[PDB]
């Protein structure tokens with residue numbers, strides 16, 4: 299056996315640019331075979347892939363993704379390691395969640411919103427059981443496969459915990475408004491701080507891709523949160539769901555539900571919504 303991720307460039311047809319990553323343009327394209335063929339893919343490119351250091355940082359997402367196999371985590375298809383260096387993944391054809399929600403607003407009901415939240419909770423309980431911390435949970439990093447299916451991507455910041463306590467910190471303009479207080483205060487990242495971010499993500503989804511604490515300053519937000527202030531209940535969010543969100547935003551990370559618990563409660567809230 300042994301899964302070989304090295305793909306041949308002849309099997310790839312490069313299509314149009316569909317976005318931008320930190321290392322370069324992302325394209326859609328086609329991955330081909332003589333048999334079991336025509337597969338639409340996303341292709342991340344890398345501007346400066348001649349530098350060992352840039353190349354190493356870029357291919358690390360791919361290294362992290364070869365560990366995962368989940369219906370709601372973006373799948374790694376392979377890599378081309380010869381220059382120009384490419385990362386090949388399954389295409390999420392409907393794109394970014396924020397854009398999708400803002401536009402498909404009048405074609406989606408409440409049950410679809412809770413479903414997306416539920417699907418993400420299964421991907422995160424999966425990571426939680428593998429002792430993997432994401433660190434960048436936000437609707438901006440959720441992608442849409444189809445109308446009834448979202449997937450977590452962006453594994454650039456994702457780290458494997460030896461289960462031992464925290465992660466450290468390197469560099470980057472921190473998404474303060476999504477961050478748990480102990481991540482802002484101690485640069486501490488755990489499954490519990492992922493849960494905090496997921497609560498903010500759920501809020502976003504329920505607000506149809508509106509951003510948390512808009513018009514508020516990154517330094518005023520920290521103080522608001524300490525003083526006990528929380529993001530308001532979204533319009534037509536069920537009281538049971540908002541209660542769930544508020545538990546995710548417990549200042550003490552030990553008081554926050556685990557993902558395995560959130561998964562079960564969302565499943566129950568989803569049935570009640572579809573039922574009533």
Ligand SMILES: Nc1ncnc2c1ncn2[C@@H]1O[C@H](COP(=O)(O)OP(=O)(O)NP(=O)(O)O)[C@@H](O)[C@H]1O
Nearest residue numbers: 316317318319320321324340387388389390452454
């Ligand atoms: N599998 C995919 N399918 C469709 N679009 C994708 C896919 N992967 C990436 N993209 C697009 O590329 C954009 C950036 O992807 P992402 O993984 O968040 O890159 P990044 O370098 O980590 N950017 P950042 O969010 O700042 O950390 C996404 O918002 C999508 O528009």
Ligand SMILES: [Mg+2]
Nearest residue numbers: 434452454455
């Ligand atoms: Mg990233």
